[PDB]
Amino acid sequence: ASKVKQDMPPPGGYGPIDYKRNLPRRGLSGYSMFAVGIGTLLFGYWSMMKWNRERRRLQIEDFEARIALMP
Amino acid sequence: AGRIASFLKNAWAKEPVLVASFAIGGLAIILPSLSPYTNYAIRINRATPYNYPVPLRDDGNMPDVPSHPQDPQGPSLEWLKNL
Numbered sequence: 001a002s003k004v005k006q007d008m009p010p011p012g013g014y015g016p017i018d019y020k021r022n023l024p025r026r027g028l029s030g031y032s033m034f035a036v037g038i039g040t041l042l043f044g045y046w047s048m049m050k051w052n053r054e055r056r057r058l059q060i061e062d063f064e065a066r067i068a069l070m071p
Numbered sequence: 072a073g074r075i076a077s078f079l080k081n082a083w084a085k086e087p088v089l090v091a092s093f094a095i096g097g098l099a100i101i102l103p104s105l106s107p108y109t110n111y112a113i114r115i116n117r118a119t120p121y122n123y124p125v126p127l128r129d130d131g132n133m134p135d136v137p138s139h140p141q142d143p144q145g146p147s148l149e150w151l152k153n154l
């Protein structure tokens with residue numbers, strides 16, 4: 001005496017189902033990354049130049065200590 | 072002018088690794104001849120006392136040889152401290 005009951009889609013329909021590709025760009029420009037790399041290299045070069053000059057001075061100092069002790 | 076521009080553009084599009092390698096090698100070849108610190112590097116190398124400085128026998132005719140390390144004569148590494 002009841003209505004016919006069956007597995008049916010809801011009245012109206014279903015919400016949209018996405019199927020198309022989604023691969024967003026999400027990236028910097030090439031110039032930006034190249035510039036960051038070059039700037040990092042230059043900063044490292046300057047730091048290493050200072051440190052190596054100081055190291056050469058220290059080496060000279062301890063070499064002179066050896067020279068003083070040699071006789 | 073334009074031929075080299077098109078060739079460089081094609082190379083940058085097809086072989087960026089080779090373009091970068093050739094640029095780096097060319098810079099490494101060229102730049103040292105134009106730098107003022109190469110002389111400083113040579114002088115730093117010459118200033119390192121690996122062996123003992125043997126004193127010279129005084130004969131009374133060397134105004135430019137010190138008789139003591141703290142004497143004003145002889146080479147000075149005052150330039151090196153500020154470098």
Ligand SMILES: CCCCCCCC/C=C\CCCCCCCC(=O)O[C@H](COC(=O)CCCCCCC/C=C/CCCCCCCC)COP(=O)(O)OCCN
Nearest residue numbers: 079081082085086089090091092093094095096097098100
């Ligand atoms: C003056 C610098 C000299 C010293 C620095 C160099 C250091 C080391 C670099 C050289 C290593 C060996 C390089 C060998 C080159 C072989 C070229 C070649 O035949 O390869 C071609 C590919 O390359 C070519 O197309 C021919 C040459 C293309 C141009 C390469 C660079 C030429 C010069 C451009 C750079 C100029 C300097 C930079 C200036 C910056 C711009 C302002 C074939 O590729 P396949 O792997 O077989 O292909 C299979 C898949 N398809």
